[PDB]
Amino acid sequence: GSMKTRIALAQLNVTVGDFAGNVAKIVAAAQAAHDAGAHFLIAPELALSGYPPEDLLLRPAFYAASDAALAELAAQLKPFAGLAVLVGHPLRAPANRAIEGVPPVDTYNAASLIVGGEVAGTYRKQDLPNTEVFDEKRYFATDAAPYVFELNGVKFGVVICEDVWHASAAQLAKAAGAQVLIVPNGSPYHMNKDAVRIDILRARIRETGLPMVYVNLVGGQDELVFDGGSFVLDGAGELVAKMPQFEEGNAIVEFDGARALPAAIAPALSVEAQVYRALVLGVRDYIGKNGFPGAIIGLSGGVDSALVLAVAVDALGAERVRAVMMPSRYTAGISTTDAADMARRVGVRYDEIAIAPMFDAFRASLAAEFAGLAEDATEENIQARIRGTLLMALSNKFGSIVLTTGNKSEMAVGYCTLYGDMAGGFAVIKDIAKTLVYRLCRYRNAAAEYGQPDIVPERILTRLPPYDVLDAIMRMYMEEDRPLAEIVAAGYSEADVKRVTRLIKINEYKRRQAPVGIRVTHRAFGRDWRYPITSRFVESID
Amino acid sequence: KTRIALAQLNVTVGDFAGNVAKIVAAAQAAHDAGAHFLIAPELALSGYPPEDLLLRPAFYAASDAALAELAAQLKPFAGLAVLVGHPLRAPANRAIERGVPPVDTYNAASLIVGGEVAGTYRKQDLPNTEVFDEKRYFATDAAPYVFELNGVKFGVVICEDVWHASAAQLAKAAGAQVLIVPNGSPYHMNKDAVRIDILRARIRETGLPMVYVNLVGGQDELVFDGGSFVLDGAGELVAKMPQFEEGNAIVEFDGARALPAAIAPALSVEAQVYRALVLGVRDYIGKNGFPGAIIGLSGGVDSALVLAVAVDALGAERVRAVMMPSRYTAGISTTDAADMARRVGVRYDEIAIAPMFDAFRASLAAEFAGLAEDATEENIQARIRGTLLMALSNKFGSIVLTTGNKSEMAVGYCTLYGDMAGGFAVIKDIAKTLVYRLCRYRNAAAEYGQPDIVPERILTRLPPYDVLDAIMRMYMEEDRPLAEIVAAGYSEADVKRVTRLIKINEYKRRQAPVGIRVTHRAFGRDWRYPITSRFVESID
């Protein structure tokens, strides 16, 4: 009659550009699948490269690196006899020739099946998302060809992420003989996204009658948090397996012929629990993937910075977080008392630095122009900028990142100060409306699993080469996306090319907060240059 | 002969009223010159590029109302037809679903004749590389538009429609004898050569003359250079308008044959780049309603260049220079800074930073006990200067123009909130090598009585939160019209206050650190708005 297929769902937390580490994570997942006796392992969208790599996908050397990593991966999977692996990767058709300026022609968002240490086949994405947070029509060409393969007597069809948004890809896969659809995803979290996913896949299942296996990335990548939540629906649309959100790992699910069999279904999290876990994972990964030693948080004594402190301690542990209160002459005693209280509750280092001497000095320096004028936002903003300068000094001297505490409501109506309360590396609650800030504090105070309860005070809740050389290397690397080896071949030293290009990468975080400026070249540091901050891509010099 | 007016207009994103006034003024001039036809640039009516305004149903409603008003205002110009670009949504403020591809929104150009829209072209090939993202906003249409004026058939294609053979072929098969091309083509060095080459590839395939009308003016990072031109049916250049200037020019056709007209004199690459910087500064200040500019002067070449550009853009009376010496700033620097400001005739002030710096040092002395002073203390100094310039900006309203160059941006020789503190980074795309060339250019281009801007020595050296949040969610997250937010039970006062502050503070959000997305419409890549915008939505 029918055979069983034992499938490992690899809900991986890969890192943009970290080919070596990503290969190691996929191999580790494969080892675990082998240890469990699986026939088949499925990894997420663009697992090999991490996701989304943004304008790395315009750089020929990035695709060359991906191809080399895919070959390394296949070699390392070869020892797992009988285990096939479906892995996402960027693909350029048959290397370092320029990527033109004109639409994508021969680059694809792909998933390849590796069998016996060789690529057995490849699917290329059809429906490229180019709305919201994605710009895949900037990077990839479309392909309409289905990919169906046989494994344990069952025909499996592959489609990738937003291919499920319309009828077309699934119908082409079914017409090519698919009996089960396999879907690698890089689907970022938002509130109610878990419901959206199951609704869209049910629409496809109504049309095709085919069960669907949905495997998602997990982890933080700059503004995005991938929540995992991989799942399986049977051919009637019933949920038969569901992995936890916001956790990395592997789960085993089974099929008997084309029938999806029941497995573990993680209980649903409340919307508040999902949002809080997103914030924790985002902070944990922005610090971890970038290699920061810890975090600094300016505490006002108010609820916004209280939430950020709670999230940071949950993400990093108290030993890697410090809190700084910076009172002015106006600062109420209850504010410093409240700030010190919460720092004690979570066991973080707490320091106070008075800003009056700096503020007095600024005020003195401007006395001639401002005298007799009403105090307004100008004076408040100077105070905020003094605070930003202090936190950035501590960050610059000892290396921890400043986590900023401006909420979405404040961002919206401009109740914030450039270079002041906005000064820092990562805006933890930039997408949390003030109303939700309160709800999340109540949530966390009650959430036993995090350890210490009631950490946010209840009372706040009821209230170089020379320039000619440097510029030449910049033009070739930045403006023209040339491989480092081609820059060296044009007559520049390996030492100079390495030094300049490393510094260009290192300083992405800084450029991304720069004021807008005037474009006069064909590749400026504006909309022409859309790079990840979190990235471990290091291109070989030769 | 057919007389065609090329309206090389400087429109403003969102400024429907003012853009209409500019087009009507151009039409008046054309009518006085006996023109049969006037051609305006790509998305002239709305300004270009409006970015995520093109996801907002009210923006298309405003555009339709503006097009109706324009047609009515053009009606007295008997005998003159006007081709105008505009965003178009097919037949009101029903939601534009942002989670699926555009379906019924187009980049359009309509011909107005006798005070009525006679016909409409919709763009076919949408740019979605470099600085453009039109596949986020618009659907493709491969229908041609060809009309007859003074006995000659004219076909319309829009900007990047010329990158491939298709649109021109479809127009020619629909009867076109001359192709008319509205553009929103931004400047970059050598872009002028790219434009003529691509149009010549099309003319090889069609044999039809082409009329290329381009936008001019600054729009956030972009500077549109104008440089509108005509090629005859063999690809010969027969007319060319100046770069970086607005104007109207008449070109004539004898039947379908393009006749020679004025060809503007050329500009060196340095001269072009310099004028782009001037126009960009002039328009960022002007279109955003800033009263003037503030520049931190170090005595070095970069801030000298930015001072020169600012004075040329705005006039000396709208620029002030501030030198902020530390205890040990070299005397040569403050003399050179003061001298530069005198030469261009601008207000100059010195504000010593040692008292602030000493106060920061004392406040951090326990924390930094035993450690050498290093880049950390240099950065504190840079941040003090940024705070000073921003205080002047905050109190009196002028924008701070920052002086970091492209080389510095590249390798990180710059300080967040310090030398990067300000509103507009004039030379962010000028490599250090090019800074020197532009200073030499500006010295070379000096007027009589003005001497070197830069000396040789230097060159060779609110409702409650529950209500606020509900209004934010409807306006920002859901792109709802203001009138619908009012109809949901919120006061006109509250809705106006909250939504005007959202717009006003775009400049500020755009310098914020990256943060975590948890909603379907965060202030990251979900929200791509122009800073320069005069879009004001009606409350009813």
Short mmCIF file of N, CA, C and O in Angstrom, two decimals, chain A residues 242-284:
data_model
loop_
_atom_site.label_atom_id
_atom_site.label_comp_id
_atom_site.label_asym_id
_atom_site.label_seq_id
_atom_site.Cartn_x
_atom_site.Cartn_y
_atom_site.Cartn_z
N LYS A 242 2.41 21.66 14.87
CA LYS A 242 2.75 23.05 14.97
C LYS A 242 3.90 23.21 15.95
O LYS A 242 3.78 22.83 17.11
N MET A 243 5.01 23.76 15.46
CA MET A 243 6.20 24.03 16.30
C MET A 243 6.03 25.35 17.08
O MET A 243 5.25 26.24 16.68
N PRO A 244 6.78 25.49 18.20
CA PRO A 244 6.71 26.71 18.98
C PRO A 244 7.14 27.96 18.19
O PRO A 244 7.95 27.85 17.25
N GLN A 245 6.64 29.11 18.59
CA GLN A 245 7.12 30.36 18.07
C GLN A 245 8.33 30.82 18.84
O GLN A 245 8.48 30.56 20.06
N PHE A 246 9.19 31.54 18.13
CA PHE A 246 10.36 32.23 18.68
C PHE A 246 11.45 31.32 19.25
O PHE A 246 12.27 31.78 20.00
N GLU A 247 11.41 30.02 18.94
CA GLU A 247 12.42 29.06 19.37
C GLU A 247 13.03 28.39 18.12
O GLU A 247 12.35 28.12 17.18
N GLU A 248 14.31 28.12 18.19
CA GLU A 248 15.03 27.41 17.18
C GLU A 248 15.02 25.94 17.54
O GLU A 248 15.19 25.56 18.71
N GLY A 249 14.85 25.10 16.55
CA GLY A 249 15.08 23.65 16.76
C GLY A 249 14.47 22.86 15.65
O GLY A 249 14.08 23.39 14.63
N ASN A 250 14.39 21.54 15.87
CA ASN A 250 13.90 20.62 14.87
C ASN A 250 12.71 19.89 15.42
O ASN A 250 12.68 19.61 16.62
N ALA A 251 11.73 19.61 14.59
CA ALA A 251 10.63 18.70 14.97
C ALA A 251 10.49 17.62 13.90
O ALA A 251 10.72 17.89 12.74
N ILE A 252 10.08 16.43 14.32
CA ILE A 252 9.75 15.34 13.41
C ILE A 252 8.22 15.21 13.19
O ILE A 252 7.43 15.14 14.16
N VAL A 253 7.83 15.21 11.92
CA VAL A 253 6.46 14.94 11.49
C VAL A 253 6.48 13.79 10.48
O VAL A 253 7.53 13.53 9.85
N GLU A 254 5.37 13.04 10.37
CA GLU A 254 5.33 11.88 9.50
C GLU A 254 4.15 11.91 8.59
O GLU A 254 3.13 12.57 8.90
N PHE A 255 4.31 11.26 7.45
CA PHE A 255 3.26 11.08 6.48
C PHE A 255 3.15 9.58 6.28
O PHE A 255 4.13 8.85 6.43
N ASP A 256 1.93 9.13 6.00
CA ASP A 256 1.68 7.73 5.55
C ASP A 256 1.10 7.86 4.15
O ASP A 256 -0.03 8.33 3.98
N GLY A 257 1.89 7.52 3.15
CA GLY A 257 1.60 7.94 1.78
C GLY A 257 1.48 9.46 1.80
O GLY A 257 2.32 10.13 2.37
N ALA A 258 0.40 9.99 1.24
CA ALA A 258 0.21 11.45 1.17
C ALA A 258 -0.64 12.01 2.31
O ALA A 258 -1.05 13.18 2.27
N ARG A 259 -0.89 11.19 3.33
CA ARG A 259 -1.71 11.57 4.46
C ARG A 259 -0.79 12.10 5.57
O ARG A 259 0.08 11.39 6.01
N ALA A 260 -1.00 13.35 6.00
CA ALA A 260 -0.26 13.95 7.11
C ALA A 260 -0.72 13.32 8.41
O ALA A 260 -1.92 13.26 8.68
N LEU A 261 0.20 12.83 9.20
CA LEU A 261 -0.15 12.23 10.49
C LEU A 261 0.00 13.21 11.67
O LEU A 261 0.85 14.11 11.66
N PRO A 262 -0.81 13.02 12.73
CA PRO A 262 -0.73 13.94 13.88
C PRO A 262 0.62 13.95 14.55
O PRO A 262 1.24 12.90 14.68
N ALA A 263 1.07 15.14 14.97
CA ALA A 263 2.28 15.31 15.78
C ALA A 263 2.03 16.36 16.87
O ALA A 263 0.90 16.77 17.09
N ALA A 264 3.09 16.83 17.52
CA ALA A 264 2.97 17.84 18.56
C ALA A 264 2.41 19.17 17.98
O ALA A 264 2.83 19.61 16.91
N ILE A 265 1.43 19.75 18.69
CA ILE A 265 0.90 21.09 18.35
C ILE A 265 1.18 21.98 19.55
O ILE A 265 0.61 21.79 20.65
N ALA A 266 2.08 22.95 19.38
CA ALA A 266 2.40 23.88 20.45
C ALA A 266 1.15 24.72 20.78
O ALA A 266 0.48 25.21 19.87
N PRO A 267 0.82 24.87 22.05
CA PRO A 267 -0.31 25.73 22.40
C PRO A 267 -0.11 27.15 21.90
O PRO A 267 1.02 27.64 21.91
N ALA A 268 -1.18 27.80 21.46
CA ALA A 268 -1.10 29.19 20.99
C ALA A 268 -0.72 30.13 22.14
O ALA A 268 -1.18 29.97 23.28
N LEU A 269 0.13 31.09 21.83
CA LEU A 269 0.45 32.19 22.70
C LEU A 269 -0.55 33.33 22.50
O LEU A 269 -1.05 33.56 21.40
N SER A 270 -0.84 34.05 23.58
CA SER A 270 -1.63 35.29 23.49
C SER A 270 -0.89 36.31 22.67
O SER A 270 0.36 36.22 22.51
N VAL A 271 -1.60 37.33 22.19
CA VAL A 271 -0.96 38.33 21.35
C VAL A 271 0.11 39.06 22.16
O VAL A 271 1.18 39.32 21.63
N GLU A 272 -0.16 39.38 23.43
CA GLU A 272 0.87 40.04 24.26
C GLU A 272 2.12 39.18 24.44
O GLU A 272 3.24 39.71 24.43
N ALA A 273 1.94 37.89 24.67
CA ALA A 273 3.06 36.97 24.85
C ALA A 273 3.90 36.89 23.58
O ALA A 273 5.15 36.81 23.66
N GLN A 274 3.23 36.89 22.43
CA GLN A 274 3.94 36.88 21.10
C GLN A 274 4.77 38.16 20.91
O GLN A 274 5.95 38.10 20.56
N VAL A 275 4.17 39.32 21.16
CA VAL A 275 4.85 40.59 20.99
C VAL A 275 6.06 40.65 21.95
O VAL A 275 7.16 41.04 21.55
N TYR A 276 5.86 40.26 23.21
CA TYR A 276 6.97 40.33 24.17
C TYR A 276 8.12 39.42 23.74
O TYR A 276 9.29 39.80 23.81
N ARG A 277 7.80 38.21 23.32
CA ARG A 277 8.84 37.29 22.85
C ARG A 277 9.54 37.84 21.60
O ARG A 277 10.77 37.62 21.43
N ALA A 278 8.79 38.50 20.72
CA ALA A 278 9.44 39.16 19.55
C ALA A 278 10.48 40.20 19.98
O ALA A 278 11.60 40.25 19.42
N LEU A 279 10.13 41.02 20.97
CA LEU A 279 11.02 42.05 21.46
C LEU A 279 12.29 41.41 22.09
O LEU A 279 13.41 41.82 21.81
N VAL A 280 12.10 40.40 22.92
CA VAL A 280 13.23 39.68 23.52
C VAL A 280 14.13 39.06 22.48
O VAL A 280 15.37 39.23 22.55
N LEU A 281 13.56 38.36 21.48
CA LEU A 281 14.37 37.72 20.48
C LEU A 281 15.11 38.77 19.60
O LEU A 281 16.29 38.58 19.26
N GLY A 282 14.42 39.86 19.25
CA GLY A 282 15.03 40.94 18.50
C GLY A 282 16.26 41.52 19.21
O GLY A 282 17.34 41.69 18.62
N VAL A 283 16.13 41.77 20.50
CA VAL A 283 17.26 42.31 21.25
C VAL A 283 18.36 41.27 21.38
O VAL A 283 19.56 41.58 21.17
N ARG A 284 17.99 40.04 21.71
CA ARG A 284 18.96 38.98 21.91
C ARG A 284 19.83 38.80 20.65
O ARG A 284 21.07 38.69 20.73
#
